């Protein structure tokens, strides 16, 4: 048994030797790894600083004519932004409808109708917005009458019970008159939108798209290097270098084009950068549908795809194919002719790009760096929103603001903060904010990404804060989203106070001019929507609360012919 | 056969080693993984903090002073004429026959002309000598600036038409006598405008740079700090600290005042900050001499100094007493009445403050500083190239019109050349020296080397404003150029305008010119003794006597003149 002792002893000696060596190896390895990470930290921090200090201004991308959506779809997204079971038919039988439409146009009927429906516990906000939008559809050919009824309704909404504090009015769209007012603002402001606000909004979108496209984007988390929102910022680092490709379009025709991509871009992302560079350099899409262009690399002429038979696999997730993967260098000929992975249901839990299983803050500069680069387009858009084209505000605004003036007067109020509260609560917060946050509603072929929605959310949060009436003091404890535009807000606050004041000072609106305009806008889209389906869906509510409506109608000394009309519509639809 | 014993014993020992080894290894592994974690967190906490600071900088640099403490013109000129040795300056600051002879001599245009030219035609004559005699001449003729202007101008006409190679390389640097002459002339003629428009914004910029650096930790040793404008002065290692709102009182009669110091300041630094916060607050200093104010702390009444019996010691170097060392809390009352270690020759090699690794981490601070002070800088600059009531200072309008005139006589149809001369003679000759040396202009101006580094950044930017080359900024640049880089192009435009606007201003009437120059002559007539100056100048005259006489003969000089020249050498000898 001394044999086993000699074997175990020799082994013990030898194992001590190994452990001793292993300790030293792992020590040196650790120290080296440390040096590496440190060097990378320095390099990336400095590179970030340098980027901030040296950002060229290349977001200058010409467009000319702007691809607005048809008014029907804009309105469709602004009236009903949830379901579209009726929108389709309302975009693209006469006796009962005529009866309901004749009925509706009677002021006291519509009044007692709305008032009755809003006098129900059984009546929710969704119903309210529904019937309000149906009303607008029904009376879009008669905006003047619509306006009048809305005014009477608003007067009621003030004088009635909201006297607890005049500042808590129109905070949010809950009543029928509120939804009504929103929709109204969309209608009467659509023109001014296309004239003044449309273009700079597009350019802000164009630019934002582009500036993010200068830096690496995880195709999975949808996170990137350039952003305005700290949540979308990339955690882990990324080693990469840009490529100046020479993409050509095609005994075949010639059409060269310099396109800038990266060594870490997925094929699809490169197709994006090329369609984008195209529409930004020329003003028109090469192909409207992104799923038509064949992309081909010339090795010595090989077609390239999202994934091929040579993709790395780690654990349970596959790595996408970048550009380094196909060994692509600087000045590589790329062909685009005329002949998806993301279409898969399970895409985010099967594919891998730039994150796997951590100094995020070293990229904070990028926020600033992005924020500066895009700032120009912002102040434009913003100053186009609260602007006075030829010292004149849009008629809708001037009228409605003068109305608020009148009503504040009629309530006997001596505190401008209130009028400011109404004014902000009825225009920038009901309408403009909803546009800045959703530009796809306005423009044709406007595919809007979640990240872009995040950044636009930051820009809009700052837009709202422009109208604040409270002196926010920025300190170490504040959202990063608020610390980006912080220094700029107190300016906007002053321009906003201005905008309101100058409007109040602008001359009154001639009733002849208001009527002319409103009837003009009625004419522009009279036959765009069918009153048919709207009145039809509206009567559903009418008969749902018929008894109540009738009772309220009695409560205000109504004529015979009117009640007879009501029962007549009921007896025609039934 | 007892081997079984040994093999066991040995194995025991061996196995034990293995055990320990593993444990050791294991523990060490953990340590590393923890170390990482810590540094990671620390890094974030600083990076973010820096970012946050850039986004939250309040404007508290608003510190009043009122009337500015200028230096007597005597010392200003003393430092702008001789910026090196002051063995002669002190004599001029605070024989009748011979001196009057020399003074009457110099006032002849032909003698002084031939003097200068001959002197400038000698290889034995160094630059330092040329500047020396130029300054001596200026001192000697300060009461007669009209004559001085005249001789200077004729000398310039000479230096210009004598070259006949490229007009863009005139007035580049100070090497001929005419050039140092030109500089000194500028100082005299513009000291007025200095006090007028450039005095205040410069002093306020110094006050501002002073305050902003005082906001963060400053290594008392390497003189490096957290808030700076040059990457070089930026701190390396992190420092851990919180601010302190001290209730400083002045003694028992009393007087209260809030001060903001740090939990990592040397006592001396705290003294600096109380004096500075005071003078920024009231407009005057409680004490001019900084070594008369006693600093006392109250714990139960206890005095505190630079080092005590309980100072930490590592390796072979001592650590200074911070405010944390004496356990000073937020709101600690500090007594100040009327009754250093930095004075020790071997100071920097014996002590320790904040160094004993990621520096780029603090690049934000440069910005954070650069932004914070920008206000003041744009003042100073836009004061320098500004036009008070649409009128450039007489001196400037005059000399610039002179340069136009001369350029026109050379048939030069190139605007770039006029621009080159104009920048080469005014902003680079005079203004830069003042940005980089505000202590020449101000009473009691302690200028730290760091402050000099920063001013060197700002001055480099200033200089870059007058440049005629479009600079494209890329990743390969200094940090100092990267800071103000996006600001330079606007300036270059303001400068081109300024030169155009000076030119388009109405000319200067000879009556107004003479009035001005004689007025400025009569102001400072008695501030310097012509005696010692002429005395030191005659040294130069007799050194190169024969050559002067030769240049004189070669220019049809009259008898009475040469007779005078020999007469003077007769008097001094």
Author numbering:
A (entry chain B): 531 to 622, 633 to 790, 795 to 844, 847 to 885, 896 to 913, 929 to 1145
B (entry chain A): 529 to 622, 633 to 702, 704 to 790, 796 to 844, 847 to 885, 896 to 912, 929 to 1145
Task: Show passages lifted from the paper.
Plexins are a large group of type I transmembrane proteins that serve as the major receptors for semaphorins. The plexin cytoplasmic region contains a juxtamembrane segment, a RhoGTPase binding domain (RBD) and a GTPase activating protein (GAP) domain. Instead it is active specifically to the Ras homolog Rap, and this RapGAP activity is critical for plexin signaling. Semaphorin binding to the plexin extracellular region induces formation of the active dimer of the cytoplasmic region, which triggers its GAP activity to inactivate Rap through the non-canonical catalytic mechanism for signal transduction.
We therefore removed the linker and directly fused the coiled-coil with the juxtamembrane helix (the N-terminal helix in the juxtamembrane segment) of plexincyto. In the CC(a)PlexinC1cyto structure, the two plexin monomers in the asymmetric unit form a symmetric side-by-side dimer. The two juxtamembrane helices are oriented approximately in parallel, extending well beyond the main body of the proteins and integrating into the C-termini of the coiled-coil moiety. The dimer interface is formed by the juxtamembrane helix and one side of the GAP domain, burying a total of ∼3200 Å2 surface area. The center of the dimer interface is a 4-helix bundle structure comprised of the C-terminal portion of the juxtamembrane helix (residues 567–584) and the N-terminal portion of helix 11 in the GAP domain (residues 929–943) from each monomer. The core of the 4-helix bundle is dominated by hydrophobic interactions, involving residues Ile571, Ile575, Phe579 and Leu582 from the juxtamembrane helix and Met933, Ile936 and Leu939 from helix 11. A loop-helix segment (residues 1038–1058) between helix 15 and 17 in the GAP domain of each monomer wraps around the C-terminal portion of the 4-helix bundle. In the active dimer structure, the last two turns in the juxtamembrane helix (residues 585–591, corresponding to residues 1282–1288 in mouse PlexinA3) convert to an extended loop. In contrast, the activation segment in the active dimer adopts an open conformation and shifts away from the GAP active site. Therefore, a major mechanism in the dimerization-induced activation of plexin appears to be the outward shift of the activation segment, which opens the otherwise obstructed active site to allow Rap binding and catalysis of GTP hydrolysis.
